[PDB]
Write an enzyme that holds these catalytic residues in place. Structure first.
Site, mmCIF file in Angstrom:
data_model
loop_
_atom_site.group_PDB
_atom_site.id
_atom_site.type_symbol
_atom_site.label_atom_id
_atom_site.label_comp_id
_atom_site.label_asym_id
_atom_site.label_seq_id
_atom_site.Cartn_x
_atom_site.Cartn_y
_atom_site.Cartn_z
ATOM 1 N N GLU A 91 1.206 -1.597 -0.038
ATOM 2 C CA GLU A 91 0.071 -0.264 -0.647
ATOM 3 C C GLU A 91 0.873 1.352 -0.023
ATOM 4 O O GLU A 91 0.172 2.416 -0.778
ATOM 5 C CB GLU A 91 -1.008 0.222 1.203
ATOM 6 C CG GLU A 91 -2.062 0.711 1.313
ATOM 7 C CD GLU A 91 -2.265 0.400 3.198
ATOM 8 O OE1 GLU A 91 -2.752 0.021 2.841
ATOM 9 O OE2 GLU A 91 -2.705 1.955 4.034
ATOM 10 N N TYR A 295 8.027 -1.116 12.065
ATOM 11 C CA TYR A 295 7.016 -2.080 11.321
ATOM 12 C C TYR A 295 5.911 -2.314 12.285
ATOM 13 O O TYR A 295 5.777 -4.045 12.316
ATOM 14 C CB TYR A 295 7.264 -1.639 9.861
ATOM 15 C CG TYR A 295 5.926 -1.557 9.073
ATOM 16 C CD1 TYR A 295 5.026 -0.311 9.314
ATOM 17 C CD2 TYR A 295 5.482 -2.780 8.632
ATOM 18 C CE1 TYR A 295 4.571 -0.171 8.255
ATOM 19 C CE2 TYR A 295 4.440 -1.914 7.204
ATOM 20 C CZ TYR A 295 3.811 -1.714 7.172
ATOM 21 O OH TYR A 295 2.941 -0.918 6.560
ATOM 22 N N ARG A 297 3.255 -3.813 11.034
ATOM 23 C CA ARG A 297 2.612 -4.958 9.417
ATOM 24 C C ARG A 297 3.853 -5.610 8.887
ATOM 25 O O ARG A 297 3.932 -5.469 8.283
ATOM 26 C CB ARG A 297 1.554 -3.938 8.189
ATOM 27 C CG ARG A 297 0.826 -3.397 8.900
ATOM 28 C CD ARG A 297 0.229 -3.159 7.104
ATOM 29 N NE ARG A 297 -1.065 -1.905 7.648
ATOM 30 C CZ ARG A 297 -1.937 -1.339 6.952
ATOM 31 N NH1 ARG A 297 -1.385 -0.864 5.280
ATOM 32 N NH2 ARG A 297 -3.309 -0.663 7.348
ATOM 33 N N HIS A 333 12.435 -7.664 6.406
ATOM 34 C CA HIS A 333 11.175 -8.118 7.065
ATOM 35 C C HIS A 333 11.919 -8.176 8.875
ATOM 36 O O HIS A 333 12.299 -9.772 8.711
ATOM 37 C CB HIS A 333 9.441 -8.514 6.680
ATOM 38 C CG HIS A 333 9.425 -8.183 5.674
ATOM 39 N ND1 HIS A 333 8.890 -8.990 4.135
ATOM 40 C CD2 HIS A 333 9.055 -6.669 4.937
ATOM 41 C CE1 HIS A 333 8.934 -8.600 3.406
ATOM 42 N NE2 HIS A 333 8.083 -6.977 3.665
#
Length: 552
Positions: A91, A295, A297, A333
């Site tokens: 997004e 982060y 998410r 990540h």
């Protein structure tokens, strides 16, 4: 001259500016800037997307954002290069794409910086190594939104017509509702089975009290289904001679949990702090933008070498060598964890009590995950009494380990095999089997995760959407299917079977993943979706005698 850096929020802008020198001018877009608002022109107009003319879309700049476009555009010329500093997810990628598209200029003038936390080091590395805009991840994000649009805009009319005005269909939302409705029906249809349990209180040669649970009679599992069977067994147990048949001591440990990911944080904050899924993500977002945690998410339990070495340093200095593994724990990540272990919840400035509590939860899970296991000396005693077998299970804490970071907090008495026990009392207990437990906000999130339906960016929007749309409700912290939820779910299940199918819905998430990794093309995927969807919608629109949707 300077380098223009764009972030999506003023909170992020402020934090990130602390780690960027004078060659950079940081600016927020105050939000997302641009986005959407057998053909039927006015439908395409409403959706902003055209399924019949190859997914051609019509983006418009959000209200009030025209001043923004100017402000950015003017800044864009005084700068030699532009850094799209949006959040790392798909997004954020699409938001960056929108900013680039609107600002215009030569692509070469743009870089897309990625970082999972706003700290001196993560920022210096993100900008040292600034890559390009990944069109595939933008494509994956638009595909998802184009199909969400389509289902919302094309199925809803069918519900207004058949069922009631104002109803909203949601591609994944309907599926989540569907889980809650199935449970409702399970609970409704459950018929409890009666069963009893008998426990016996005994005393050791030493005089120590020892409670037992009858586990067997005649070498078969013990389970009276009524009072008379129970009474029969109670009469015999009353006369029997009790002796220890076996003592099974065995060292046991309890391991700390892996560090948080979006799903497990929602569950934990819900179960431990009584925080709802939406409040958690909003507070988590603020912590992240303020530079306090990584982060929010993510679905990775990965921890960087530096993160792990700084927490091991913390464990070593604050708890001691016996709380520190020989080697670091690898759980996989990055996971959600504090940015600096040396920052305590009590020290956050821009945050309120509940966001401090959530930080504390994240911090403890993080620290605890790299500590050693708790050690318990467990005992399982098997007793014999006539035709019966009874059991007692206990454990003694040997070493706290990881539990040391958590707030402060059965021990069987010692007996030996062959030891006699004197029966003091027998206590029968009537019990009833219970239907499936209702979903809580945590159980539902876990279920969506387990079924491959939710994603880190969707979990909470799904949870909140189905409620607000009046399909289900949460009372006494449990989910209840509303009648309209059941009404819509049956209609949808009958006429849009594939849309409502759990595995099909999980596969759509993977098809999206395929697009993000250049394993599939977005419009081809949208075409496949739309083909299955319109045939479904074609049928559903017929009269009930021809298999269309049933009214009311």
């Amino acid at each position: 001259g300077k380098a223009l850096v764009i972030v999506e929020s003023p909170a992020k802008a402020k934090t990130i500016n602390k780690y960027l020198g004078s060659d950079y001018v940081v600016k927020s877009s105050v939000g997302h800037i641009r986005d959407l608002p057998d053909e039927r022109g006015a439908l395409v107009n409403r959706m902003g997307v055209d399924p019949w003319h190859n997914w051609e879309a019509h983006y418009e700049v959000l209200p009030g954002k025209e001043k923004v476009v100017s402000e950015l555009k003017q800044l864009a010329e005084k700068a030699d290069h532009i850094y799209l500093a949006t959040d790392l997810d798909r997004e954020g990628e699409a938001i960056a794409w929108h900013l680039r598209e609107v600002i215009g200029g030569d692509d070469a003038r743009y870089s897309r910086v990625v970082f999972n936390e706003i700290t001196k080091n993560a920022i210096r590395q993100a900008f040292n190594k600034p890559g390009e805009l990944n069109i595939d991840r933008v494509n994956a994000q638009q595909a998802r939104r184009f199909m969400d649009r389509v289902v919302g805009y094309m199925v809803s009319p069918l519900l207004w017509k058949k069922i009631a005005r104002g109803l909203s269909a949601g591609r994944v939302q309907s599926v989540a509702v569907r889980l809650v409705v199935e449970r409702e029906r399970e609970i409704k249809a459950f018929v409890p089975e009666e069963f009893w349990e008998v426990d016996a209180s005994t005393t050791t040669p030493s005089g120590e009290a020892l409670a037992l649970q009858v586990t067997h009679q005649n070498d078969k599992p013990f389970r009276p289904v009524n009072k008379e069977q129970t009474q029969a067994a109670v009469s015999l147990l009353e006369k029997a001679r009790y002796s220890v048949l076996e003592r099974e001591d065995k060292p046991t440990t309890s391991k700390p949990g892996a560090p948080f990911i979006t799903s497990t944080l929602q569950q934990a904050a819900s179960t431990r702090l009584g925080f709802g899924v939406k409040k958690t993500m909003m507070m988590a977002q603020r912590l992240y933008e303020a530079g306090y945690i990584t982060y929010m998410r993510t679905d990775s339990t990965n921890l960087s070498q530096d993160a792990v070495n700084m927490v091991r340093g913390y464990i070593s200095d604050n708890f001691g060598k016996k709380y520190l593994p020989e080697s670091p724990n690898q759980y996989a990540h990055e996971a959600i964890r504090p940015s600096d272990v040396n920052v305590m919840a009590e020290s956050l400035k821009d945050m309120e009590a509940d966001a401090q509590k959530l930080y504390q939860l994240i911090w403890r899970q993080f620290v605890a995950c790299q500590m050693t296991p708790a050690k318990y000396d467990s005992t399982t005693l098997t007793v014999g009494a006539g035709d019966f077998r009874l059991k007692a299970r206990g454990r003694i804490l040997r070493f706290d380990g990881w539990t040391k970071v958590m707030p402060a907090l059965r021990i069987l008495p010692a007996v030996n095999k062959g030891d006699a026990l004197t029966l003091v009392e027998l206590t029968p207990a009537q019990h009833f089997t219970k239907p499936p437990a209702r979903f809580s906000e945590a159980s539902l999130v876990k279920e969506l995760e387990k079924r491959g339906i939710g994603r880190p960016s969707t979990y909470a929007s799904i949870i909140s959407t189905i409620q607000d749309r009046g399909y289900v409700r949460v009372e006494n912290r449990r989910f209840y299917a509303e009648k309209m939820g059941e009404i819509v779910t049956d209609r949808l299940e009958e006429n849009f079977r594939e849309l409502m199918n759990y595995d099909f819905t999980a596969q759509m998430e993977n098809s999206l993943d395929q697009v993000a990794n250049h394993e599939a093309e977005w419009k081809a995927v949208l075409d496949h979706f739309f083909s299955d969807f319109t045939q479904q919608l074609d049928k559903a629109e017929k009269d009930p005698e021809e298999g269309g949707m049933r009214p009311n």
